[PDB]
Amino acid sequence: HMKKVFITGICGQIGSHIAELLLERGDKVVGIDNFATGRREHLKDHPNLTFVEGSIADHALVNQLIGDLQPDAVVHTAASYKDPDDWYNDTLTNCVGGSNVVQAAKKNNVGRFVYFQTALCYGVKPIQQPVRLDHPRNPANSSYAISKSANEDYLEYSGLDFVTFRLANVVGPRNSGPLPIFFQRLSEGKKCFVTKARRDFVFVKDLARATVRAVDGVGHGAYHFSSGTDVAIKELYDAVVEAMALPSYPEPEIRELGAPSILLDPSRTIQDFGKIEFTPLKETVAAAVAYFREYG
Amino acid sequence: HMKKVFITGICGQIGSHIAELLLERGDKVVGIDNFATGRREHLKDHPNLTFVEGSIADHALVNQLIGDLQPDAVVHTAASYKDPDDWYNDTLTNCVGGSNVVQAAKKNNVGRFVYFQTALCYGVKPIQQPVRLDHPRNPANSSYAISKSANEDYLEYSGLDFVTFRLANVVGPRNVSGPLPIFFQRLSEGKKCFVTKARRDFVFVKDLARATVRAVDGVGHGAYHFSSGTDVAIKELYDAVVEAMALPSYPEPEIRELDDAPSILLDPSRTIQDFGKIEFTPLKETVAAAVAYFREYGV
Ligand SMILES: NC(=O)c1ccc[n+]([C@@H]2O[C@H](COP(=O)([O-])OP(=O)(O)OC[C@H]3O[C@@H](n4cnc5c(N)ncnc54)[C@H](O)[C@@H]3O)[C@@H](O)[C@H]2O)c1
Ligand SMILES: NC(=O)c1ccc[n+]([C@@H]2O[C@H](COP(=O)([O-])OP(=O)(O)OC[C@H]3O[C@@H](n4cnc5c(N)ncnc54)[C@H](O)[C@@H]3O)[C@@H](O)[C@H]2O)c1
């Protein structure tokens, strides 16, 4: 049967990709986005899609939309982050908007809630390697992590049946971060710093299809959505130059560290979501780069 | 001879008592209150006082008030809490409003920032007794604790020279929340009161206000448990109220059983280290002061 799904931040990387999967299998999708960072083009028209331009900080709007629709699931991807000095929109969107969305879902007995969270909730340098789901919380390292983490608090407090995907880095088409930086600089002929660190990168499309399973009732609570492996920043850079189809090899500026590696332990995710086949790094980066070429 | 101090929640229990201390010594005080819980009558007029009705959620107002004053210090007492289901105001006041206040202070190079935090940052049933300052943070037990602790996080993150007083319960005149105003009202209406079999810390607002002035003046850095390190049974608080009201006979309370800890002590050690050995006002004196306020101002 046709599910009803409310998606916040539906014109963003993660939300638009989820929206596409749901719409293609016949679900009814209602979405909200204010275009802080998302783009209208990310979300193609579909007869079962309703799009509302607005902010999740708008309490009456969020309640009206969820109240009317009575969704089977809320997928909450909306987040403010782009300017680290903009504490105002970070709190207004992630705290006021985030609790608005959580409480509306709880008020309307929404059966499933999917949230997305930064691994910065554990601090910038974890005390566990790999980081386990019981790593102490240390979110006061940025406006983004602090506010994102207060939104998670409200979700855990609400009593909703939820799934939170805690993520290192999500990359692909529609994506900020190292990928667009690398692409942008190499396009301008600029030399890139490549630090001697390993980090975890996850294709948005792997995450989108694990979300559909969460919408369908797979999983409860917080998970590390990770392969359990990490990649060197050099390997990421190399993948970007490879997809860019350069007459080059431009040797980067190797830069010493100033954590060396952040592995997220995926044991609970393997347990409940099964052994997932994660898209290979080159293919993930190829898709991200084809998107940059076409848009920016 | 005249510090400039900006107070948020200036018409509340804690803010107004701090304003009074600063004004009587010759300081210049500017304050803001939306009357979500406090009262205009809590803040008496004074030549060196400027009062502004408004919300700290208003980014432009906060930045204009602090921007125009260039305070030596910000005392941030404003908080939303009174309706546990009102997540919107809690996050708009505590998170948006609270981050506004912290960031405006930092942008304006404010030398000292004093904040007030709930010991619910630690959870409802702590795993240390006495609770130490390194106790794990478990704030996801109420809208109040979650949004207060986000505000605390921004303060820590800002780079400001701050003191946070972490508190159990603050009581005395102008206390509008918690058991004390409820005991007074129900006792004066002849209604049955409920006493839980639990022990909690209660601190006289005026002790806290005098420590805040020291903190404004440069005493302490970081987080502290503002506490004697003792606690009292709720039954003792109730009995102190009956005796302060001089009721002609003792009204037997209804005893509730205690999820939650039987007793929460906060370790005062770092407070003694940096603020010295504070003579805490005894409960009897604290409750008599509160009862005197409730008889004049009502609940
Ligand atoms: N590396 C990553 O991209 C990554 C890693 C960890 C966590 N996450 C989380 O995943 C979620 C989505 O991430 P993304 O990569 O798709 O980011 P994104 O910027 O592509 O999408 C977020 C969307 O939210 C919208 N939005 C912002 N404020 C809004 C508001 N007040 N009301 C309505 N819409 C608003 C934006 O315009 C944007 O479309 C976020 O919660 C983010 O914190 C992402
Ligand atoms: N009172 C306690 O037992 C206790 C215990 C732990 C922590 N604290 C903290 O101490 C601080 C002060 O507590 P109190 O006992 O003085 O409470 P209070 O309610 O008397 O004071 C809070 C004041 O802030 C004002 N306020 C609320 N939202 C505002 C907004 N958006 N803009 C401007 N003003 C606003 C209220 O009207 C009120 O006057 C609060 O931050 C509280 O969380 C108090």
Author numbering:
A (entry chain C): 0 to 174, 176 to 258, 262 to 299
B (entry chain B): 0 to 257, 260 to 300
From the paper:
The wbm locus contains three neighbouring SDR genes (wbmF, wbmG and wbmH), all of which have been annotated as nucleotide-sugar epimerases/dehydratases. The abrogation or reduction of O-antigen expression as a result of wbmF, wbmG or wbmH mutations implicates all three genes in the biosynthesis of this molecule, and is consistent with the hypothesis that these three adjacent SDR genes catalyse the UDP-d-ManNAc3NAcA to UDP-l-GalNAc3NAcA conversion, which is probably required for O-antigen synthesis.
The C terminus of His6-WbmG consists of a loop that stretches out from the C-terminal domain to interact with the Rossmann domain. In the WbmG and WbmH structures, the dimer interaction buries 1316 Å2 (5.7% of total protein surface) and 1562 Å2 (7.2%) of surface per dimer, respectively. His6-WbmG and His6-WbmH copurify with this compound from the E. coli expression host, but in order to stabilise the protein in solution His6-WbmF required the addition of exogenous cofactor, and this is the most likely source of this molecule in these His6-WbmF structures. The preference in each case for NAD cofactor as opposed to NADP is indicated by the close interaction (2.7 Å hydrogen bonds) of an aspartate side chain with the 2′-hydroxyl of the adenylic ribose. The active sites of WbmG and WbmH are devoid of amino acid side chains capable of acid–base chemistry except for their respective TYK triads and, in WbmH, Ser176. Structural analysis of these three wbm SDR gene products also enables us to distinguish between them in terms of potential catalytic chemistry. The hydroxyl of Ser176 in WbmH may be capable of facilitating proton exchange; however, an amino acid pair capable of acid–base chemistry is required for 3,5-epimerase function.
